Amino acid sequence: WTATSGSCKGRCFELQEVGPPDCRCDNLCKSYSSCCHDFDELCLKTARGWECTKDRCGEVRNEENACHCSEDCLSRGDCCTNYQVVCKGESHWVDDDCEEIKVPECPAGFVRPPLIIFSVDGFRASYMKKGSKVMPNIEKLRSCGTHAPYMRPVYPTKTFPNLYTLATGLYPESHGIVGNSMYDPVFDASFHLRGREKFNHRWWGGQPLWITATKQGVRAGTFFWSVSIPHERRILTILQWLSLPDNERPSVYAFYSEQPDFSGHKYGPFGPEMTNPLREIDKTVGQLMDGLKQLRLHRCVNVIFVGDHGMEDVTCDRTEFLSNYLTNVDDITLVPGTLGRIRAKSINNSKYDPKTIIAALTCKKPDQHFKPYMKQHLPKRLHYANNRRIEDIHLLVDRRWHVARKPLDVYKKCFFQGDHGFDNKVNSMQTVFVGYGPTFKYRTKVPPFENIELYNVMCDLLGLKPAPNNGTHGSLNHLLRTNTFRPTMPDEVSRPNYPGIMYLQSEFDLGCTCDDKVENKLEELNKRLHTKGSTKERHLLYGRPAVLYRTSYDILYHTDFESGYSEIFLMPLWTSYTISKQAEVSSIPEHLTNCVRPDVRVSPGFSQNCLAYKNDKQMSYGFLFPPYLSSSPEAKYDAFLVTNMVPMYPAFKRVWAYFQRVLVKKYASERNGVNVISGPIFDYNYDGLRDTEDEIKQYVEGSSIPVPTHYYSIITSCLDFTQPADKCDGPLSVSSFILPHRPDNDESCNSSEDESKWVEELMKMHTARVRDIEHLTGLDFYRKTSRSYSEILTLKTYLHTYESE
Ligand SMILES: *[C@@H]1O[C@H](CO)[C@@H](O[C@@H]2O[C@H](CO)[C@@H](O[C@@H]3O[C@H](CO[C@H]4O[C@H](CO)[C@@H](O)[C@H](O[C@H]5O[C@H](CO)[C@@H](O)[C@H](O)[C@@H]5O[C@H]5O[C@H](CO)[C@@H](O)[C@H](O)[C@@H]5O)[C@@H]4O)[C@@H](O)[C@H](O[C@H]4O[C@H](CO)[C@@H](O)[C@H](O)[C@@H]4O[C@H]4O[C@H](CO)[C@@H](O)[C@H](O)[C@@H]4O)[C@@H]3O)[C@H](O)[C@H]2NC(C)=O)[C@H](O)[C@H]1NC(C)=O
Ligand SMILES: O=C(c1cc(OCC2CCOCC2)nc(C2CC2)c1)N1CC[C@@H]2CN(C(=O)c3ccc4[nH]nnc4c3)C[C@@H]2CC1
Ligand SMILES: [Ca+2]
Ligand SMILES: [K+]
Ligand code: NA
Ligand SMILES: [Zn+2]
């Protein structure tokens, strides 16, 4: 109930919300049907429009006007934004040369530079270049401030998941807003764009910026605007709030624009009708900046111009229909469009089988424009699994396409020419970032980065301590002139053992055999020193990884590689080796094909055994350091140590063999040497975090050898490729992956062809940040470099995307 009887007089755009049934005058009241009767008349004035004209100058205050051109307007803080331009001979902000803002130039009483976050829905990254002639204010912010060529949204590249990620620093799986549409089985409730359920606080996890600010005594301007409130009024309201007394004035403000998304959907991302909305967004930016300049705030405020996602060309005829694949199509619920989520229509139907649904959707048509996944098999870089609101069965839809259940859904719902929601690596989904202000750098371009990082930076801009989040705090320090955050490296929790020769061959009863009874003081002091770590500076370029949890592990040295061997998981946590440009690929000799050798430094009790693999009809084994890249016939024997062995399905060995035999050498050739760190990952509960031993769901049959869910590699070289990887003087270059360890290659539709036609594409799909691998393994890489820690943090967040220019 709303008793709409009270009044908005002197309460227009009030900052604290008041409790029903007392009527409301805040910027959200319309959206709750809760405004006082007089809200429109008092708060939403329009008379005379939004601009002063020559003859309105020095007029007598008429309170009915939308904005004022009277003499007192300045000190009332309610001039039209162009007032000083029309009436006092001033220039537009956009026409002034830019001048470095070395320090905040703020009115007396300002305790910190304010922050204004100007967010634009559907603003595709390439609009910065392609619409540059029609957006002169935006181009001035961009070229004078700090900008990235684009910013990576989160998956799915929808409106609510991305806006709430900007607010929280959290993946949608952690913040809970996993789509624009959702079913929560615990609540038995549904979240939709249209309607009231979305207002209930139980949907919204984490801690968004406005709450972080409030709890720490920073005042927040109410972030959200009822859709009917026009843009000009939002700007004037912000400017008016900025005129409040010190004790009442907020420090952080939000403006949201529905454009260009709204038009992008109707006309496609580059439709000729898209010029106008871009012009209009720019004009609004101009009004803000002119408004700030009038208040002498234009060298005081930090302004963020940020998009939630881009926009792709998508039409009704590019729809796949599940009714073309599925016989039981009425027994499923589909969340449709640019992604697919499938569950059973009814939980009482015990004949619903996800396994058979997946198989029926897998590689069925030569040009199929979606791929089905169990959510835990999605590329780990999407971080899209650990939420009860994310259905077990997911469809990754090709860019430019839609998925629907039945054709009736598409014509009883071509209207639209643009959409978004695809894989967040897709170029058309990239969006924008521009920071302008005393705290951002001057005329600086920064590399692309992910939107999950910005919450930390907005917290830094306001002197707040961020709630725990998925950003890597410090990885965006290179955006900022000051207020940087100086993190320390995490402390190593477990130190390694350095075992020597402690066991005799005959103590091993592993069912392993090797043709190695093949016989000198020159090459014997030599093998001793290699086992003591004489070549360790060659293969361990950035120090050993730190183990950040309690465990028992050993460092093992070899001529060609170094490993940290886990006595608990019976395999390395990591294996590190360097392959120079000059290195040679060799094959495994025939006498060594099934050779597995006991490691005399590690107890039988802490070793794998060959018998488990013989018994396990599903499971085979591979090696972390590839025998193909051994430096010499004698060094090759080290690669067959039982301590370099890891469990691998035969289907995954195809993937692994090609990577190790062909790709490593190829990268060394292209990058002038590479350092490689490889290892297993165990993520049975798909939370993106290292499993403890009691979480492991699968072992090699009859043994305690745990089966990894994934294998990672981190491939580092010199950013200046004219220097070799092992003698690099400056910044580094990295690419990494987290390959799912699967008993089949159903994911790759062309897997019956030669590995040369499908493996690299699979790896590219499962590209990863080093930081993703840190979460998954409890390890911390690049501990010993000459580089600044902030720069290392930036490198650890890098994602090699494999999209063109
Ligand atoms: C991205 O960053 C985020 C933030 O840093 C990371 O997520 C954190 O990871 C922590 C480790 O998994 C996790 O810690 C757990 O928290 C439990 C209490 O948590 C509540 O309080 C916080 C603080 O206010 C709150 O934010 C949480 O909010 C979640 O839950 C509500 C729903 O109730 C949602 O609205 C909200 O969106 C959020 O959901 C997300 O997280 C949960 C898990 O917490 C998921 O299940 C959801 O899918 C969703 O993703 C909470 O309200 C605490 O009870 C846990 O402690 C257990 O485990 C420890 C091990 O140390 C042990 O000491 C205890 O015994 C205890 O076990 C008991 O509970 C078990 C489960 O019932 C049971 O089996 C046992 O036998 C015991 O009874 C634990 O410490 C933290 O909550 C989240 N935070 C957030 C915001 O998600 C995320 O990891 C990062 N991602 C990556 C890839 O890096
Ligand atoms: O006020 C907002 C808002 C702005 C915002 O800011 C967060 C800032 C954090 C700091 O960093 C900067 C951001 N956070 C949110 C939610 C997440 C908490 C909402 N909205 C008004 C319009 C409504 C109507 N919508 C639609 O009707 C709609 C719009 C576009 C669509 N595309 N496809 N479907 C669509 C449906 C979208 C819906 C949400 C957007
Ligand atoms: Ca886990
Ligand atoms: K086997
Ligand atoms: Na296949
Ligand atoms: Zn949209």
Side-chain angles (χ1 to χ4, degrees), residues 339 366 418 438 549 566 574 672 794:
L339 52 154
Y549 59 95
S566 166
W574 58 261
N672 188 5
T794 303

Side-chain angles (χ1 to χ4, degrees), residues 738-751:
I738 299 170
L739 281 168
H741 181 213
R742 276 180 63 179
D744 61 76
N745 291 297
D746 296 346
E747 195 185 344
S748 310
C749 296
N750 61 329
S751 59

Side-chain angles (χ1 to χ4, degrees), residues 121-122 158-159 180 261-262 265 309-311 419-420:
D121 206 341
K158 293 301 210 186
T159 295
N180 282 347
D261 182 84
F262 180 80
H265 277 290
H309 52 72
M311 182 71 72
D419 207 359
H420 50 86

Side-chain angles (χ1 to χ4, degrees), residues 613-614 616-617 619-620:
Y613 292 104
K614 194 180 162 285
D616 203 314
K617 294 298 187 280
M619 190 59 65
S620 180

Side-chain angles (χ1 to χ4, degrees), residues 695-711:
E695 265 150 10
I696 302 311
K697 294 163 73 46
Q698 201 187 330
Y699 289 88
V700 184
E701 184 175 292
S703 77
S704 279
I705 312 169
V707 170
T709 52
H710 295 82
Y711 286 98

